[PDB]
Amino acid sequence: RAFLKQPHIFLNSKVRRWYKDVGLGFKTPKTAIEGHYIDKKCPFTGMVSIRGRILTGRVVSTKMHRTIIIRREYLHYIPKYNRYEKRHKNLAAHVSPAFRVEEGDMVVVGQCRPLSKTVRFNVLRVLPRTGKSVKKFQKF
Amino acid sequence: RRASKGRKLRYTVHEKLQNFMAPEDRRSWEEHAIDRLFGTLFGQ
């Protein structure tokens, strides 16, 4: 392994840390301000820029190396029944270690450049809720 | 698993790799002196 670094900041001088705000009415967490982890797919540490769509949802599987899957439920209109039906989708998002992670919580994600085959999103805000496992349902 | 891109020797009979070359025995020695040779190396 190689020494992780913020790509253009001169640490070895004998005479800091770069963190940008994402914007969009958000606040930088204290771990993203001073916490000594280094991750280049972090929108507060690396150079990844959030633009475009802004989504929310509830996590299925937190247990993964910095990537969470969101079950997004919605109500589709079948015209044969003239009715609303539940349809669940699964998104993937890269997780900064700045936030405190929970399972079943409602998490805000944001759209970035493609970071992998699935990963197109980063976490921006986590709402800590007591949401349950796969049996729980709410359109969100 | 951690084995996929050729890391694990997947012993599968390959279809176009099946009948390339005929075995051509080109050995100028008569098979009775050769097995006596491999015995009498540095140990014997």
């Binding site: 969009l24 009415g25 633009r51 475009g52 802004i54 | -």
Partner: protein, 232 residues
Amino acid sequence: HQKRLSAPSHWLLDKLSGAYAPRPSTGPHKLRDCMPLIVFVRNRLKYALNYRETKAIMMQRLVKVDGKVRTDITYPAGFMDVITIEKTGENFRLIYDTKGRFTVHRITDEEAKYKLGKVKRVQLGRGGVPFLVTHDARTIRYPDPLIKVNDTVKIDLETGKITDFIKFDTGALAMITGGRNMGRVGVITHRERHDGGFGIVHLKDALDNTFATRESNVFVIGSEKPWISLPK
């Protein structure tokens, strides 16, 4: 080589010019926001009859567009290009109407001398110099330091310098150049930010119709001050 129906609905063609329609050449204005010079000469004004007659007008130095001689036939002239013909002694100006089509306006040299162009972007160019990009793709070096985005500028057109500018304002009357409410001369009375893409303005006409148009599709024309003569 598009068909006459696939040509856009705002530079008009009748049942006359064949099934085909000329495409505008690449230039300052866009493709779908465009009036070519052949459609301006022989399909709108009817100073000509045929393509070869339009070529015989264009190739001799008789048609000047934005104060410079434009030779090629399908040169794009979309919005507010003063078109000076000297043998007839006329200068036409391109504006829109309330329905959403191109309109021609005859005028003389005093209003023909300047162009009201909307600023597209302000930046720092090479040499450490601020420069200014309008919708005519005119870049002006060393502008006035308050002329920000979506401000309009009175371009000199004999030197090309800045003469005056109109700021983006809630209370300044404006012209719509896009969208489902296209071509409706009214006053900007409200502006909503919508940060994260595609902000809007709320705009009313002279006679009380409110509607929401995007800040890309707007175009400032003057507070009261009709600096170009909209046709009476």
